[PDB]
């Protein structure tokens, strides 16, 4: 047959972009210590004006019909 | 009193006992700076630089109830009003904003906000006044207590003003006894009236009976240093080392946010207490619990709108937010992390309440309070 | 704006100091303007550290 997707890509039903059959995790990249000082994320979350997601219109509709079954987020 | 069929509604009710008044500022002291006796156009300069006791001035209990219900909660008010036009408009104002008025008693013997006194010239030429006939607000007797609000309400909130009149002392103590018999908490707000700012010992004698019955107590920074030691806590604040600082922060001469240790607030602590809150305006909130204590950090901004800034009523919003989050989340009592996270909503409400003229005109909404809390605080905190 | 002494244009600014003198507003002249750090930001920002290290735009010298 055609996978466990039923090849939702072939039909068009909602489905994750990546394949939920491999989804191999990361391989322990460099941690904060082994990074140069320019890429460090300085261990204390910094206040920024762009820290709250933009309200937007379509983010309301997507959440609206996700409850009614027309959308699978 | 046992009449009921279905369970109570979702938001627990709040009991607000006191006097119904419009734009009242109880806590009054001598401010060092004055800005012209006649021109009121420049008085707003005292809202950018408050006298350190009107930084977050609390008001009547009706203001607290209105701020609490506007934040998404439910509140009820116990009080008495006269059969006047002002008395009929105060209840209208409270009713217009979903404040339950089932426990407000109308009477015709006394007039609202009007009290009859008598001139009593003493030795020398210093006049005095003795209350001949009491005002309508402070004339509630224990017989006309609504034994339905007390049963339903889960938190009993009252302020110290009712301790300045004889009849309300007995009425308040009877209401406290009834509410405790029905299992409700007691929230004590210490917005001290002017006569109670006379001496520490007299005030401590006056408020001891009410203090020992409280489960939660909220006081300002000045109302605590006054109750423990004004001179010592004022000498400690203004102190800089003669040679060299101590850590580094002392070398920056920042503001003094002192977190009082549990051995200094011990004289004001008793077994029945569940929480002690000390608010330094909206800047910081020190919370003391039976097993832990800490400080929640906040900010303030009244120069963001220098022409429509009015600090009056912010303390009521802070207390109302505290009560709303206490009743909504019952796990804050024994969880310091949740306690700190839920105590920033009150700070956001207090910040918003200082951006408009009028105590009741501009109390913040729950959505606006959450918006400001999320916009000021880093995602890790909120 | 206001024409001050010696025919110099002056503008009002709120002085930030830990003394709370009485009137915290001053009328600054152009000669006294470029040697102070005039903020135009806000105090509505809180980080896990202390609030006094938050960053706001300012105007020092002519930058």
Swiss-Prot record, chain C:
Summary of subunit composition and partner proteins: In plastids the minimal PEP RNA polymerase catalytic core is composed of four subunits: alpha, beta, beta', and beta''. When a (nuclear-encoded) sigma factor is associated with the core the holoenzyme is formed, which can initiate transcription.
UniProt similarity note: Belongs to the RNA polymerase beta chain family.
Entire-sequence positions represented here: 442 to 504 of 1070
Function statement: DNA-dependent RNA polymerase catalyzes the transcription of DNA into RNA using the four ribonucleoside triphosphates as substrates.
Protein name as annotated: DNA-directed RNA polymerase subunit beta
Lineage: superkingdom: Eukaryota
Subcellular localization: Plastid, Chloroplast
């Amino acid at each position: 047959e055609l996978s466990e997707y039923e090849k939702d890509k072939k039909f068009g039903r909602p489905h994750p972009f990546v394949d939920p059959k491999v989804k191999k995790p990361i391989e322990e990249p460099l941690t904060s210590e082994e990074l140069w000082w320019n890429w460090r994320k300085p261990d204390k979350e910094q206040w920024s004006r762009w820290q709250r997601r933009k309200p937007d219109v379509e983010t309301v509709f997507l959440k609206a019909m996700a409850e009614t079954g027309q959308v699978k987020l | 009193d046992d009449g009921m069929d279905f369970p109570y509604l979702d938001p627990p009710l709040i009991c607000c006992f006191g006097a119904v008044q419009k734009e009242f500022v109880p806590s009054v002291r001598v401010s060092e700076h004055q800005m012209d006796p006649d021109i009121y156009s420049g008085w707003k300069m005292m809202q950018w630089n408050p006298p350190e006791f009107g930084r977050a001035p609390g008001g009547p209990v009706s203001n607290v109830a209105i701020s609490h219900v506007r934040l998404g909660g439910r509140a009820a008010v116990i009080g008495k009003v006269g059969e006047d036009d002002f008395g009929e408009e105060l209840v209208l104002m409270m009713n217009k904003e979903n404040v339950q008025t089932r426990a407000v008693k109308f009477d015709s013997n006394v007039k609202t906000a009007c009290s009859y006194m008598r001139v009593k010239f003493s030795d020398d030429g210093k006049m005095k006044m003795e209350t001949v006939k009491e005002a309508a607000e402070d004339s509630l007797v224990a017989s006309e207590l609504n034994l339905a609000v007390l049963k339903e309400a889960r938190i009993f909130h009252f302020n110290s003003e009712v301790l300045t009149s004889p009849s309300m002392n007995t009425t308040l103590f009877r209401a406290i006894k009834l509410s405790k018999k029905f299992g409700g908490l007691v929230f004590f707000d210490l917005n001290l009236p002017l006569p109670l700012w006379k001496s520490r010992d007299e005030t401590r004698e006056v408020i001891k009976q009410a203090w020992e019955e409280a489960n939660i107590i909220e006081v300002s920074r000045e109302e605590l240093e006054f109750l423990l030691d004004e001179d010592h806590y004022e000498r400690r604040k203004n102190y800089r080392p003669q040679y060299y600082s101590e850590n580094y922060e002392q070398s920056k001469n920042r503001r003094d946010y002192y977190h009082y240790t549990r051995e200094e607030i011990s004289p004001l602590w008793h077994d029945g207490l569940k929480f002690l809150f000390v608010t330094d305006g909206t800047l910081r909130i020190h919370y003391y619990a039976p097993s832990f204590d800490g400080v929640v950090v906040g900010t303030e901004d009244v120069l963001i709108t220098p022409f429509t800034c009015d600090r009056t009523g912010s303390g009521d919003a802070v207390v109302a937010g505290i009560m709303r989050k206490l009743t909504s989340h019952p796990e804050m009592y024994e969880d310091q992390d949740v306690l700190e996270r839920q105590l920033r909503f009150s700070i956001a409400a207090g910040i918003i309440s200082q951006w408009t003229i009028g105590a009741v005109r501009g109390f913040p909404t729950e959505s606006a309070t959450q918006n400001l809390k999320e916009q000021v605080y880093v995602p890790s905190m909120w | 704006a206001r024409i001050g002494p010696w025919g110099s244009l002056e503008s009002p600014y709120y002085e930030i100091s830990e003394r709370s003198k009485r009137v915290q507003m001053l009328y600054l002249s152009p000669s006294r303007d470029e040697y102070y750090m005039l903020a135009s930001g806000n105090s509505l920002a809180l980080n896990q550290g202390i609030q006094e290290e938050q960053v706001v735009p300012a105007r020092y010298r002519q930058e």
